[PDB]
Structure formats: structure tokens, C-alpha cells
């Protein structure tokens, strides 16, 4: 049995800018059980159906997971733009796979704010699909070099979400899992 529980029920999730990727292989995957396994608020598959996923085999399955704002979940889809799609986690236009999300306010918000979850707010250019950027150099927003010194036009590139339990639903944390289905010239190991 594929260790989906390890991904979906992990105690901590990654920050979106440092999104985690888990490789799943050599196992049987029941995606109908996965679909019905909890109340997910988002469960959208692109080019595939979870019922038809049960009759397919893949070389590897990849599960990307992270936390974002509720208002940002729509950016975890092919063809989207915004601070998450552009600078944190980018799906390809031709994405095949599934996107699953659920409200995680009970786990990831703190009274006073959970500042452990971050996203990249400043970046010179957009991310390529499935690119990950974990640099934290002070970001030069003007003509004057920063030399590692924060100040006017010189910004730490990551921002904390600061999730609080009293946030409105759209600003509460949502845990997200993206499933990608890989086909290599190699024996199938996930069926």
C-alpha cells in the first residue's frame, strides 16, 4: 500500500516557497479511497479521473505538499498567475495530475500568529513549472546595491503568513497536495 498517509497526515507541512516533494513507488494506490478519505475542499484532477486512476500504472508518483492561504488555492492550477504561481509553486500549462486542498486552520494557525509558514514575495522573474527557489538574499528593488543590508528598496525576500485562528476563511491556512504521475521507460511500480 502506497504511504499516502505519510504525506496527507504529516504533522508539519512545508512552506510553499520550500515545497516538499515525496516520491512514491513500488506500491498499490487506491485513489478512490484517497478521494473519499476525508472532506477535501479542493480535489481537482487534470486530464485524469480518480476513478480511472485506479486502472492505470505509473513509474513513480510525486506528491508535492505545502501550505498557502485559502485565497491562493486557485493559483495551484495550470495557467494561473499571482504571487504563489509566479514566485513559489508553478504548475505547467499541460499539467496532468490532481490538486487536493483542505482547510488547516486547526493545525497551522496560532493565537498571536504562526510565523513559521512563509512565501516568497520578491523575485526578479517567474518560476518555471516545478521549480523551487529557497534563496534568501536581500532583494534589490532599486538602483542602489544592498550588500546584504535591509532598508529602503532592500528587502528580505520571504514574508510570513502569520496565520491566526480568527483570520477569515480566505486567509486561513490550507494544506495542499499535488499528485504528479510519471511515465519513464522503466517498469511500472505504482498501480
Amino acid at each position: 500500500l502506497c504511504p499516502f498517509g505519510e504525506v496527507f497526515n504529516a504533522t508539519r507541512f512545508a512552506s510553499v516557497y520550500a515545497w516538499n516533494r515525496k516520491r512514491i513507488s513500488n506500491c498499490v494506490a487506491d485513489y478512490s479511497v484517497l478521494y473519499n478519505s476525508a472532506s477535501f475542499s479542493t480535489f481537482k484532477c487534470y486530464g485524469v479521473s480518480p476513478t480511472k486512476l485506479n486502472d492505470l500504472c505509473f513509474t513513480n508518483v510525486y506528491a508535492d505538499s505545502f501550505v498557502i492561504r485559502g485565497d491562493e488555492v486557485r493559483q495551484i492550477a495550470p495557467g494561473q498567475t499571482g504571487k504563489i504561481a509566479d514566485y513559489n509553486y508553478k504548475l505547467p500549462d499541460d499539467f496532468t495530475g490532481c490538486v487536493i486542498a483542505w482547510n488547516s486552520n486547526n493545525l497551522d494557525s496560532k493565537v498571536g500568529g504562526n510565523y513559521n509558514y512563509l512565501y516568497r514575495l520578491f523575485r526578479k522573474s517567474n518560476l518555471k513549472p516545478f521549480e523551487r527557489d529557497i534563496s534568501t538574499e536581500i532583494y534589490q528593488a532599486g538602483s542602489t546595491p544592498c550588500n546584504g543590508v535591509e532598508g529602503f528598496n532592500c528587502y528580505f525576500p520571504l514574508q510570513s503568513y502569520g496565520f491566526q485562528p480568527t483570520n477569515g476563511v480566505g486567509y486561513q491556512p490550507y494544506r495542499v497536495v499535488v499528485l504528479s504521475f510519471e511515465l519513464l521507460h522503466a517498469p511500472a511500480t505504482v498501480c
Epitope: 499571482g82 509566479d86 502569520g162 477569515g168 480566505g170
Partner: single-chain antibody
């Protein structure tokens, strides 16, 4: 010097077209959130468009499909192409750095006039010199009451708005600490204490409202009596 300098403008008939320019100094347009904000004569502020450092563009519902934001990195200049103009596009158009909530509109151009032929604030408020006044800004749980992306602006006649408070209670460098921002439930408040004649001005609140909607209050005129 840090500058944002608009050009272009004038009088157009409905269905006409105009392109505005915003030439920056020190601020690097291609590396920043850059926006246009407009103000119809005698009225409040309305966010128009933002251009992201990576090239993504977003637009207010009122202009989507008619306006286009763009830039020339070699000229360090931001542009607003405005097509299919209507009478209701009449406004002073400001460029500004920021997206209006994260990061806030901290730096503003001078404005340029184009003529084509919600958050609840009290219309007015007053206080006495050295005393205090509280300006309220009432939203809903999906904006003011749902997050901390609330800003406050001061605007004097003939000048661009000036960022006074961001993130509910944070003051930009140089803003006097007798300007204080807070929030209770769905209502944000700007408290101005130690009131001085120069505090006479219009004050606007702003809040992100989700789905790339940026809201401004209708403005409060502050009289110091």
C-alpha cells in the same frame, strides 16, 4: 533621488484612447510591484492595475479588457494604455510602487488628469488642536475583519496620497507616532492625536478583499477646529 513622474493626459472623447507614462528614478520598475491608482474629481481613490516584477498583470473589474499595464525596462518607465474610454474613466491617474496591500503603496507619483467628456468611512470628522480624533473604516469579515492588510492614507489638496499606516498599525519611516492604526472586529480606526493645523486633510482606508480586489474607503475630511 527617488521619483515617480507621470506624463500623458488631457481630454478625450468616449471611445478614444490614451497612454500614460510613469518614469521612475532609483525605484527600478522591472523589479517592483507597480500600480496605477485613480481618483475622479472630488471623489475617492480606486485601484486600477498592478504589474508584477515577473510580468504578471492584474486589473480592477472596471477596467479589465480595456486597459493594459506595461513597462520598458531600458527607460525605467511604467505605462498605462487606456482603450475604449468612458466618461467614468475621468480621474487624476497616479502611479505608485506596491500592490496596495503586501507591499503597500509606499511611494507615489504626482498624478496626471485624464478627462473623458466596500469600506464605509464617515464623510467628515473634527477635533481640537493638541487633541485627538478617531477615523473609522468599516468593512466585512472578508476584508478588514479577515486579515491585517489594512492601510491608511493622508491626502492634502493637489497632492498625491501619502501612506500613513500599513498592516493595520505599522507606520512607515518618518510618519509621526501620533498617527496610530488599530482594528476591532470589522472596523479599522485611524487615531490622530496631538492634532495640528496641518492634519487638515482627507484620510482614506484601504483593504485587500480577496480575488485580487483592492478596496478603498470613501474618504473622511478632517477639520481641526
Amino acid at each position: 533621488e527617488v521619483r515617480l513622474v507621470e506624463s500623458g493626459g488631457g481630454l478625450i472623447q468616449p471611445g478614444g484612447s490614451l497612454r500614460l507614462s510613469c518614469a521612475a528614478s532609483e525605484i527600478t520598475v522591472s523589479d517592483n510591484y507597480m500600480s496605477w491608482v485613480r481618483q475622479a474629481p472630488g471623489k475617492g481613490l480606486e485601484w486600477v492595475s498592478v504589474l508584477y516584477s515577473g510580468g504578471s498583470a492584474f486589473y480592477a473589474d472596471s477596467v479589465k479588457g480595456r486597459f493594459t499595464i506595461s513597462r520598458d525596462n531600458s527607460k525605467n518607465t511604467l505605462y498605462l494604455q487606456m482603450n475604449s474610454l468612458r466618461a467614468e474613466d475621468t480621474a487624476v491617474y497616479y502611479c505608485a510602487r506596491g500592490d496596495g496591500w503586501e507591499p503597500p503603496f509606499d511611494f507615489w507619483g504626482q498624478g496626471t488628469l485624464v478627462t473623458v467628456s466596500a469600506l464605509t468611512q464617515p464623510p467628515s470628522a473634527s477635533g481640537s488642536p493638541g487633541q485627538s480624533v478617531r477615523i473609522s473604516c468599516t468593512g466585512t469579515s472578508s476584508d478588514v475583519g479577515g486579515h491585517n492588510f489594512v492601510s491608511w492614507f493622508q491626502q492634502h489638496p493637489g497632492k498625491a496620497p501619502k501612506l500613513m499606516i500599513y498592516e493595520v498599525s505599522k507606520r512607515p519611516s518618518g510618519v509621526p507616532d501620533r498617527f496610530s492604526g488599530s482594528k476591532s472586529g470589522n472596523t479599522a480606526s485611524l487615531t490622530v492625536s496631538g492634532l495640528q493645523a496641518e492634519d487638515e486633510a482627507d484620510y482614506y482606508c484601504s483593504s485587500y478583499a480577496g480575488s485580487n480586489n483592492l478596496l478603498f474607503g470613501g474618504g473622511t475630511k478632517l477639520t481641526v477646529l
